[model samples]
Target: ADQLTEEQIAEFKEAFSLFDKDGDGTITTKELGTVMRSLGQNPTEAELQDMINEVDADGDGTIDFPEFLTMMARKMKDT
Candidate 1:
């Protein structure tokens, strides 16, 4: 398991909060799409769904902080 340090955890929380536009503690599909575009990626609805499906472990159709952190940590490990 990947253990996030305090600073890394803080950074992830900040980034997650930014994508969670509604302050709802989770990133909705729309919010995820918008953030992707802001980062210069134009994702189709299907692509967005694919992303959520990959990391939305609770199956709530949104990416909560834990899910987001898990995804990020996995990506970091891959790199």
Candidate 2:
């Protein structure tokens, strides 16, 4: 992935902090579910699994900053 600009980096960091509940420095499916609920959307288990699989490049069952950035970058490019 290419380097992100300062603003993009900061935004990503903020997002990660919001999603990384429990201060684990990683975003788990459970955490994501909570976020989804907070957004007034309820995602199915399959949807959550698919989402994690899409960006869990290291296969650790969670999203770290780099994976999150890559996913965000890919999504932004597609739009």
Candidate 3:
């Protein structure tokens, strides 16, 4: 696991809010992919699952707020 300081976590909070529209404090694996689709981004099941795996240390296919907070990824879609 990479080292994450308080600063990155603050960034995480801001970034994750864009997905947790339900305000339920958790991110579903299904919604993770759907969130992309909703914004005009399409990601395949396997591709998306692979991404979830990277962040979800437990590999439960579901990402909690804690797990979501530690993930960092670059944008592939410039649109």
Candidate 4:
């Protein structure tokens, strides 16, 4: 399954865990922006919000571990 190997999943999960400041299993727009900034990509608030809305499956304005994995898998396949 190319969905995400255990190690890849673990890495993304760790990133998500670190970003989920409230420990609610969901990342806020602010949290997402912060995460991107930490990666040295300064995305605007709107850009970050769009990224979340684009990837967040539940449309709940947050991206959980599963959603994050899916997004990463898609990106890997594209590359």
Say which candidate scores most in lDDT: 1
RMSD, every candidate, angstroms: 2.2, 2.4, 5.0, 1.9
Query: Which digits, one per residue and each the tens of the lDDT, describe model 2 over residues 51-74?
Result: 778889998777778877777777
lDDT string, candidate 3, 1-79, tens digits: 2454476677667867866756687777666776778889887657877777877887677676677654543232222
For lDDT, candidate 2 versus 3, the one ahead is 2
Candidate 3, lDDT over the whole model: 0.67
- State in Å the error of residue 57, model 4: 1.1
RMSD of 4: 1.9
The candidate 2 region of ten consecutive residues with least summed lDDT is 1-10
Worst 10 residues of 4 by lDDT: 1-10
Model 1 C-alpha lDDT versus the unseen true structure: 0.77
Q: Which candidate has the top score in TM-score?
A: 1
What lDDT does the true structure give each of the candidates?
Answer: 0.77, 0.75, 0.67, 0.76
Model 4, span 24-77: residue lDDT tens: 877787777877788898988798788788878987877778877776677777
Please provide TM-scores, in order, for all candidate models, with all chains considered together.
0.77, 0.75, 0.57, 0.77
Q: Is candidate 1 or candidate 2 better by TM-score?
A: 1
Residue 12 local lDDT, model 3? 69
Ranking by lDDT: 1, 4, 2, 3
Model 4: CA > 4 A from native: none
